[PDB]
Design a protein around this ligand. Sequence first.
Ligand SMILES: [K+]
Ligand SMILES: [K+]
Ligand SMILES: [K+]
Ligand SMILES: [K+]
Ligand SMILES: [K+]
Ligand SMILES: [Mg+2]
Ligand SMILES: [Mg+2]
Ligand SMILES: [Mg+2]
Ligand SMILES: [Mg+2]
Ligand SMILES: [Mg+2]
Ligand SMILES: [Mg+2]
Ligand SMILES: [Mg+2]
Ligand SMILES: [Mg+2]
Ligand code: NA
Ligand code: NA
Lengths: 70, 183, 142, 77, 58, 100, 141, 73
Amino acid sequence: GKIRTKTVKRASKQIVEKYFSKLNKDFYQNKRIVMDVTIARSKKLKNKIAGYATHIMKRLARGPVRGISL
Amino acid sequence: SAKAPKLFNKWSYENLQTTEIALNDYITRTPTYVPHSAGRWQKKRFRKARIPIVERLTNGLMFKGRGNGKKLQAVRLVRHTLEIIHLLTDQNPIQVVIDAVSKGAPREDSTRVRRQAVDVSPMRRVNEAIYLMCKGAREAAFRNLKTLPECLADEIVNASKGSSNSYAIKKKDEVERVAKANR
Amino acid sequence: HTLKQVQTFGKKKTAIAVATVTKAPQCNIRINGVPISQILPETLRAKIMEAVKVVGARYFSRLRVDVRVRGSGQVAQAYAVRQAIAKGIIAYYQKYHNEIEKAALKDKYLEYDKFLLIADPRRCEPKKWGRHSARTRFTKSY
Amino acid sequence: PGVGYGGLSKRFSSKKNRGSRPEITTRASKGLLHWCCKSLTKLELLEKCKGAGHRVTKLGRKVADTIAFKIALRKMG
Amino acid sequence: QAQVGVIIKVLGRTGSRGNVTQVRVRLMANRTIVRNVKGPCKEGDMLSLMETEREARR
Amino acid sequence: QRVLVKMTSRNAKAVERVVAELLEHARTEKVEVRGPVRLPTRRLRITTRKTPCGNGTNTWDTFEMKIYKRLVDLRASTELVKKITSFQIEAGVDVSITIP
Amino acid sequence: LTLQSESFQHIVRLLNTNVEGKRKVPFALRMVKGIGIRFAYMVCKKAGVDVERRAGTLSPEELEKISEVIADPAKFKIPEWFLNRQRDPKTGKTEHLTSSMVDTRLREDLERLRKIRAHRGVRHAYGLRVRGQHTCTSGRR
Amino acid sequence: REALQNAVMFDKETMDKLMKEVPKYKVITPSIISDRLKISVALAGKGLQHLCRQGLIRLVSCSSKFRVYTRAA
RNA sequence: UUUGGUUGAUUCCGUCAACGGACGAGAUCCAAGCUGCCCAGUAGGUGCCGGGAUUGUCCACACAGGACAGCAGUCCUCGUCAUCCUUCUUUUUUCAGGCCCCUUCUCUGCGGGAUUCCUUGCUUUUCGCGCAAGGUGAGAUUUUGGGCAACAGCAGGUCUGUGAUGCUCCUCAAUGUUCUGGGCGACACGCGCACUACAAUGUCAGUGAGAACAAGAGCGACGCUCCCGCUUGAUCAAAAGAGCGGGGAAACCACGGAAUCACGUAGACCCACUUGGGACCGAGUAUUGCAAUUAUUGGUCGCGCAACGAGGAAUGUCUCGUAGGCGCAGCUCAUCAAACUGUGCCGAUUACGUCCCU
Ligand SMILES: [K+]
Ligand SMILES: [K+]
Ligand SMILES: [K+]
Ligand SMILES: [K+]
Ligand SMILES: [K+]
Ligand SMILES: [Mg+2]
Ligand SMILES: [Mg+2]
Ligand SMILES: [Mg+2]
Ligand SMILES: [Mg+2]
Ligand SMILES: [Mg+2]
Ligand SMILES: [Mg+2]
Ligand SMILES: [Mg+2]
Ligand SMILES: [Mg+2]
Ligand code: NA
Ligand code: NA
């Protein structure tokens, strides 16, 4: 399975809230931003966080999301 | 310029057809030079159907504990078998192999569910034809003056002709007869 | 007169083959010093010769190919040599030729066999204690 | 060039059947290879290296290549 | 003889051991049956039914 | 090849700091150096049964030790070499000087 | 590829033993007690008999030549280390035993050990193993 | 099923059979010949090589262990 | 901390008399597969110069001799500058090498790379969490294998690991300690686990090419003591013995010639308990050790007339470089591996499910 745990999902919501501008729907540019503003150690975790953040931006472009509150 | 490959540089793939339309998509006739590819054919469920048909016959010859893993020896046994087949029938050896495979497995089978009669999928029909022909030849050549390539050639030629002297044909008739008498 | 030369490599299991391709008076292929057409197992000779028959011999017209192989059994070494030659002809057409001919050669190789240009990543699995091999467990008695 | 009797015994080895025990690899006998090198030296096709081992002389290289040209010309009648 | 039919839809695995599968097959004049199949199969496969006077319980 | 300096340690970070700072001293004087060579790293292995008595499922433990080696080549006069390598070494690093 | 003649004999009597005539000469001589595969090849070489013939179609002249070599191997330059019974414990001579002299000599060896009551003689008389093998689970007759 | 009872040397009857009737077959193999004429497989292999030298049959497939012949025609 | 979907997952989404938190799972760590810097007098390569060897107008073409690249002599006039192979030890101007250059291959300390990322179709009314097939790719689902692993327990094992330990027993003709000799193995039988086979998809005898993990030296007898190589023994078996050398291990062994394997070898055998199989037993030899008898081990010739021709009821392990087959190193070790711990080589059939049995 490929379920994202609560540690990944919580961090992605925080990043989108703080850096909504300068994020877009491209994984590769979002990954560079995530590495810049995240302190954690695991590279695998940072890849997953950038992936879920890109997913949220796609959802936001079509309608509001219950947990963001921009 | 590049010409089309010929098996062992002797037999062409130009005019090969499968009369049985049910098994057309599971018998692969892509031209190759030798029955040896070393590919990853078991990664997905239906990927093994794309192995070239002659290589499938080769893979079925290394079965017992003393034969496990000896692919180069099996290629040599197949090479001599094809020459005997061509002399016996005076046709393309690859064509005779295809006809034997298309007529060597039962179409109806019985399963325990009292037993009930069911139908056999095309993939299993191709798999069972190779398995039965190789087993019939291996058992016939044990403790016998005849060599393995002659036993395999006789088994394949009889199966293609539909004769009852083949081990695969006798097994096919008995299984289908039981399924009919069952239900 | 300037020297035209490239160097490529191929791999299979623990075998590494290094091929150097240069412009010569006449085509000549040698593996570990013995010419092709002298490789004793004709099955393995036909496998190595696939790197020439698939594209055609008119592309190997005046090229000398020298191949050195080290590291594994006979079959795995033949698949490494096969890959080194196919990548060598592509490298020799990337430089000293243009893209249209290089693309034509590459697609013929790829539509025949993927492993002519891409290495097979499979390797031996480690053995673990309590097992006779990578996966076979000890016999239980009751 | 420079190979010795121990190196040659590696070349001519085989596997030995030990009865109800697992098989094992066995090297060739060094004494016989010592005899063979002595026969070739008397024919003046072999010689001792300055450092260690054996190597072919100029005559030995010439004889070997002369035989090869015979096979290439199919003079094996 | 035998008649050829084409699998349209796979309905699911049948039996306690899950070695049988139930399919919907169309004959070669627009007649549709439901049959039990042994062996791996997918949509678009062809079967050689010995009789078509028959139906599989669902 | 006048002087060969070989350093070995069980700590990867420690052996890199010693090599880097040794290169610093050589460059600060302007003595020619053949770049550091990373020799193959070795693993020592010991496998033992976990139990002290021999009961239960036969389970094993694997212990490993890694050894790192670095080689630096210097071409400098006699008294210059002692000045270059006079500095103190960190704990757990062994330095040897050899004249080939 | 030569035609079979009338004189071909299916059974060859040699050293009080019936030897099959359909076998090749080295592998037909091995049917005699005291002659193995290695010894049979050396006997044929010293007697001048080609090893690629059958045991039948062997003339009487060749059979007498083979018997002479077997009787006295040392006369035909067979080394001492190639023979059984290399130094007799009773006579100190090197010989080669064949054709039921093997059985007679083996019987004498067993009685010699039993008379002085050596350990190996004792275990032979009891019907047990004599070469240090374990006997808990092996024999099980 | 009893024993094969295969001869090891050629006889007058079997030699003439080999020279006359064998060159008519379509598939010729030492095991096949050893069955039609009750001879050893080793003897049959030598006889077939003799026929090939004479030119009455032609070698089709050759290997160290397997030989396949056919009528020259 | 329930239920509905989903996940290997008390993994997530949603709902909710609960709200906030801790562990475990995941993450972290080690190894493999693709790559960036760095790097070499212990890893390797082209280029010239020198030295050594083969060298063909035509015809000739194995005794029975075929199928498969190159070709300035063909093709339908264009296209070729130049035949190949080796240079180990060794150090020298010849005892055969010398020079100038590079980092594709090797070595590795930090880094990059993969995220259900893209497309299509499904998914409790919608949504959400996700799934399948294809794509991109060295690699496409916990990437592949391991290591670690909560809370509760069991009268499971160990007082034969310890200068771990409570009570208790013996304690100077000792249950302490040492020395000599035996035993731990003894054999009408029952059981677990391995090795070798029952042959031709074979046995024997030759020729050819070809791996990885590793290891190695300071009491008792003036240094030595461990592991190897080259010669010699040799005007005559193996196994020994003896000289001369090398290695503290990317510098020796070593260009690491493993066994399955291959051979158009014009090899031997031909369906039989047979050249299958090697149990049992006799006789001579050398080595380890202070000591070989109850055979330490190796090697030689005999014995092969010991079963065994595929194995009833019952039963073990296993899904991809895996199963099976084949050897090698380490370990125990003065001398002994049919064991275990690792390593590489050849390399498949079947399934991509279910809750019928456990
Ligand atoms: K056990
Ligand atoms: K106690
Ligand atoms: K014991
Ligand atoms: K028991
Ligand atoms: K043990
Ligand atoms: Mg054995
Ligand atoms: Mg074995
Ligand atoms: Mg509760
Ligand atoms: Mg699930
Ligand atoms: Mg034998
Ligand atoms: Mg012996
Ligand atoms: Mg013996
Ligand atoms: Mg026997
Ligand atoms: Na064997
Ligand atoms: Na037992």
